[PDB]
């Protein structure tokens, strides 16, 4: 299938630079334009620039003058976006998106394929990996025939953390909550799942926590609560 695969979330200090990658799969990179679009949660997307990987031609939005560079490596079907002299206000999700190669001066810069986005956070604060604790099922976490269980992902900085269950094989009934900001300046979230209570004891439930800024990958097997 046609996809755009982006590099992981990053954290940078103010004044530094970030370089995000975008790998085209299922189509040839040089047959379309590649575009970069950012979005800070709470605002509409903001288009940054385009690149034609075949010709080495680029065009940037005036708001990013002298700060962005779009490059490519056609041998590995990859496009790159480098944003420099980073400011706190550059904290956002950065997407790569495909559009058609336009002849001069035809129109058509709309986006028919997108990467999943890369969160880039600009901060002076220290990076901190999360602690993962079980939300163990007990007699106090049932509703009829349903049992709830989960994982508490506490004290990490910056965002994001991702949580999967059973390496992505368990998705139905999962709620990974939006993070909260604690008074400490660290984030926390929980991921819960509802399952048959008849399933406890035969089924295995493992939460897979990933925090790319601290290179944290934790697997936690969740078992019935110790009394």
């Amino acid at each position: 299938e046609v996809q755009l695969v982006q590099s992981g979330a990053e954290v940078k200090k103010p004044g530094a630079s970030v370089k995000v990658s975008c790998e085209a799969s299922g189509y040839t990179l040089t047959s379309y334009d590649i575009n970069w679009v950012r979005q800070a949660t709470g605002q509409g997307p903001e288009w940054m620039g385009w690149m034609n990987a075949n010709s080495g031609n680029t065009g940037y939005a005036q708001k990013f003058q002298g700060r962005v560079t779009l490059t490519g490596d056609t041998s590995i079907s990859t496009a790159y976006m480098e944003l420099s002299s980073l400011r706190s206000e550059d904290t956002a999700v950065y997407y790569c998106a495909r559009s058609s190669i336009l002849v001069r001066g035809a129109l058509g810069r709309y986006f028919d394929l997108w990467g999943r986005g890369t969160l880039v956070t600009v901060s002076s604060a220290s990076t901190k990996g999360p602690s993962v604790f079980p939300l163990a099922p007990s007699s106090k976490s049932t509703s009829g025939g349903t049992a709830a269980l989960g994982c508490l992902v506490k004290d990490y900085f910056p965002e994001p953390v991702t949580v999967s269950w059973n390496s992505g094989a368990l998705t139905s009934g999962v709620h990974t909550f939006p993070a909260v900001l604690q008074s400490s300046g660290l984030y926390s979230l929980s991921s819960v799942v509802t399952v048959p209570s008849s399933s406890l004891g035969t089924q295995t439930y493992i939460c897979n926590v990933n925090h790319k800024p601290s290179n944290t990958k934790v697997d936690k097997k969740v078992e019935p609560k110790s009394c």
Partner: protein
């Protein structure tokens, strides 16, 4: 740049309703307008291009109209998977501007939450702090009141809530309320209770445990 203004900023409609969203361009853009739907934690996804052309694989319930400076997106029969934020985007010129979006919230019948409580893990207590989590699952509407009681004393200032986005299939929400105490403060009390008040509940539901059972 061409400023794109969308209206309304937010709307709430039921499954089966006919919904219209407008987009205004600060100057003429002919028909060089695209529409996208953005679902939570996802990139925007293309619905329409050239003001009225339906992107391949997009459901037939979506349609677009307009030219020049005034454009409309119509959803003929709103479905639960239509919740999200809708953006218009001009591509007549730089900076290929998007609007600020229209948030579409789905209305549905009242659904009472199922309530679950979790004592802190032995592993976390070993580290010096106790997080007690109360889960309100799959309810509608979003308005819910959660009150923490420790040995029947009403708590204030030691909890935080988080609510999910609406579910793409059943349009409900879930919510977590987390009470955080030091291990010393947690060890001073016995009864830990989460009291939930919601429109779908005849009277408040309390989920509680005694520290150690």
């Amino acid at each position: 740049d061409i400023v794109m203004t969308q209206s309304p900023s937010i709307l709430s409609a039921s499954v089966g309703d006919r919904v219209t969203i407008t987009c205004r361009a600060s100057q003429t853009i002919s028909g060089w307008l695209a529409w996208y739907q953005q679902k939570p934690a996802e990139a925007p996804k293309l619905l329409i291009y050239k003001a009225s052309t339906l992107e391949s694989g997009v459901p037939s319930r979506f349609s677009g109209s307009g030219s020049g400076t005034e454009f409309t997106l119509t959803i003929s029969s709103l479905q639960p998977d239509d919740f999200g934020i809708y953006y218009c985007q001009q591509y007549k010129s730089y900076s290929f501007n998007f609007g600020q979006g229209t948030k579409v919230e789905i209305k549905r019948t009242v659904a009472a939450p199922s309530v679950f409580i979790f004592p802190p893990s032995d592993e976390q207590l070993k580290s010096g702090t106790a997080s007690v989590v109360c889960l309100l699952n799959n309810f509608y509407p979003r308005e819910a009141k959660v009150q923490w009681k420790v040995d029947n004393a009403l708590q204030s200032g030691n909890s935080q809530e988080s609510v999910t986005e609406q579910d793409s299939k059943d349009s409900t929400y879930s919510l977590s309320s987390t009470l955080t105490l030091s291990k010393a403060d947690y060890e001073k009390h016995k009864v830990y209770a989460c009291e939930v008040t919601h429109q779908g509940l005849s009277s408040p539901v309390t989920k509680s445990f005694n520290r150690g059972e």
